[PDB]
Every structure is written in C-alpha cells, then in structure tokens.
Design a protein around this ligand. Structure first.
Ligand SMILES: NC(=O)c1ccc[n+]([C@@H]2O[C@H](COP(=O)([O-])OP(=O)(O)OC[C@H]3O[C@@H](n4cnc5c(N)ncnc54)[C@H](OP(=O)(O)O)[C@@H]3O)[C@@H](O)[C@H]2O)c1
Length: 170
C-alpha cells in the first residue's frame, strides 16, 4: 500500500482576459483557435475535470480521446460519455491512481477548490477586455511562481495579443 503518497498529478488550465473574465452565459466570450488547439494538446489522452455549469455551457458534449469527469452534488446527474463525481475527495482519489494527468478545466468554483491540490497552472492571458459574468477566482498566488511564458502568434484567425504562461509551486 501507498496510502501515504499522492502519485497522480493535477494541472489547472484556462484562458482569461485582462479583467480575469473566463466565461459568459456558460460559454467563452472570445474565439481564439490557437488556444483551443493548445488546450487539446494538454488534455488529449488525459482526464479533464469540469464543474457542472461549465460542462452544460459546452452543450453537455465530451471531447473525444480523453476521459471527462463532471463534478456535481446531484446524485442522479447523468450525461453522455462522462464520469460523474460528487466531491473534491472523489476527484482526488481518482487522480491519485490515474496513470496520466488530471486536468482541472474549470469553472470558477472548481478552480478555487482544486487549485490548492494542483502542481502546475497553464494560463493563456488574453490582452483584451470582453463582457462576461464569470471570473477566475481569488487564489493564493504566494505559493506559485511563473516558470515560463511565450507570446502567441496573431493572424486572421487569432485576433488578440496573448501569452501562454506556466506556473509551478515555490
Ligand atoms: N451575476 C451572476 O449571477 C453571476 C456571477 C458568477 C457566475 N454566474 C454563473 O455561474 C455559472 C458558472 O460559474 P462557475 O465557473 O463557478 O461554474 P462551475 O465551476 O463550472 O460549476 C459549478 C458547479 O459544479 C459543482 N461542484 C463544484 N464543486 C463541487 C464539489 N466539491 N462537490 C460537488 N459538486 C461540486 C456544482 O454542481 P451542482 O450545482 O449540480 O451541485 C456547481 O454548482 C454560469 O452559468 C454563470 O452564468 C453568474
């Protein structure tokens, strides 16, 4: 037994604007194709954890070739093609014994609860302001430091200046 070790890994990944906006009416308030492609690279063949509201904002659809977990207090919640779990503890138990990375995909409640258990943050900082109703939550930034940053390429498909940032624990 290895009940005294945590042998999995949690990454939180998200895109936000310069106000900290991450969503509006369930959906993304911007379109930035390169970031979606980066996101798929990080989640492909891994596990993606989503709070119920975010999941439903995506039209209740799972991304292929990943395992998605939907978090909800509702014991009877079922959706198509996803695991459903009902507590942080339950998420952590799955993550401990999962062979790949358990990616925390949001939304705000999920980030605030699970970021304390994460080992890395992948943030896409979009340098523009949009209208939204959901913000990245207040977290303890004192335990994190930025270890990498790369500017994103703008083109006819990607309209906004943006940075891809990586944070690790100090
Ligand atoms: N002006 C305002 O009214 C305003 C301000 C902020 C956001 N909102 C809105 O709220 C939504 C999304 O915000 P969000 O990013 O915080 O949503 P989210 O994190 O994606 O999902 C939140 C939900 O996941 C659940 N969950 C999270 N932790 C859990 C736990 N430890 N155990 C069991 N279930 C857990 C709940 O499902 P269950 O509820 O089924 O238990 C919960 O309500 C949007 O639809 C949006 O419009 C509006």
């Amino acid at each position: 037994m290895e009940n005294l070790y945590f042998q999995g890994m949690l990454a939180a990944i998200w895109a936000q604007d310069e106000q900290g906006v991450i969503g509006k009416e369930g959906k993304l308030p911007w379109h930035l194709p390169n970031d979606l492609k980066f996101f798929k690279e990080k989640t492909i063949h891994n596990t993606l954890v989503l709070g119920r509201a975010t999941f439903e904002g995506m039209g209740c659809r799972p991304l292929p070739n990943r395992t998605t977990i939907v978090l909800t207090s509702n014991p009877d919640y079922q959706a198509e093609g996803v695991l459903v779990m009902h507590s942080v503890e339950e998420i952590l138990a799955y993550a401990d014994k999962y062979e790949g990375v358990t990616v925390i995909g949001g939304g705000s409640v999920v980030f605030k609860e699970l970021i304390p258990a994460c080992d890395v943050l992948y943030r896409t900082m979009i340098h523009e302001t949009f209208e939204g109703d959901t913000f990245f939550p207040e977290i303890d930034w004192s335990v994190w430091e930025k270890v990498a940053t790369v500017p994103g390429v703008v083109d006819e498909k990607n309209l906004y200046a943006h940075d891809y940032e990586t944070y690790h624990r100090n």
